[PDB]
Amino acid sequence: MASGVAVSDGVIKVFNDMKVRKSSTPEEVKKRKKAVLFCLSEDKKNIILEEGKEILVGDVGQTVDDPYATFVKMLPDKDCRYALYDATYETKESKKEDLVFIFWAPESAPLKSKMIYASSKDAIKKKLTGIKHELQANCYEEVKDRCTLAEKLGGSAVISLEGKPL
């Protein structure tokens, strides 16, 4: 077995909402996932998503002050996983959102949950179909760096990455 990994479909199901967003009123658009932290199944060969690991956007104003912090927070270097963060920044003109597949691949992760992901980075995109943007890091600094997510929107005119951090 070369490509030891098989998405559970739902990965696309939970992502289908990220690509299309799926909003309407102010009581919904706010409840948008700002970092769907996925993860490998138990068999260690089935790309799936998590249930208790998915940050939103409205949280920034609800109870949370900085979602980007929640990400790396539950993004240890020993837990190689996937993620799709939304570049909800505020440039000198208006706010924008660039879906960036935050590829959490900590080189120091467990080989028993890393050899797959690394060799699965392509299996995942097999369904994503060359996702628009993305960001893969192997360090808390690289993942917990505001400038990092500001490297695919236009820092040249970004007065804020979250209306505060920048």
Half-sphere exposure of 7 (CA within 13 A, CB side): 18
Q: Which strand (E) or helix (H) includes residue 39?
A: strand 33-40
Instruction: Compute the distance between CA of residue 114 and CA of residue 103 in angstroms, rounded to an integer.
Output: 12
Provide the pairing of β-strand 33-40 with 47-56.
antiparallel
Nearest to 87 by CA among 148, 23, 5: 148
Q: What is the largest CA-CA distance in the chain?
A: 51
Our CA dihedral for 64, 69, 151, 12, rounded to 10 degrees, sits at -80
Nearest to 76 by CA among 47, 52, 108, 50: 108
Nearest to 160 by CA among 85, 88, 59, 89: 89
**DSSP-assigned beta bridge partners for residue 9:** none
Task: Indicate the domain borders of the chain.
Answer: 1-166
The token duo for 65 is: 């002050």
- CATH number, span 1-166: 3.40.20.10
Q: Could you identify the residue written with the tokens 């597949």?
A: 101
The token duo for 76 is: 């240890």
3-class DSSP assignment, residue 44: coil
Contact between 81 and 109 (Cβ < 8 Å): no
Q: Say what angle helices 115-128 and 10-20 make with each other, to 10 degrees.
A: 60
Contact between 76 and 55 (Cβ < 8 Å): no
Quickly list DSSP for 81-127.
Answer: B---EE--EEBSS-EE--EEEEEE--TTS-GGGTHHHHHHHHHHHHH
From residue 62, alpha-carbon distances to 27, 28, 119 in Å are 11, 13, 38
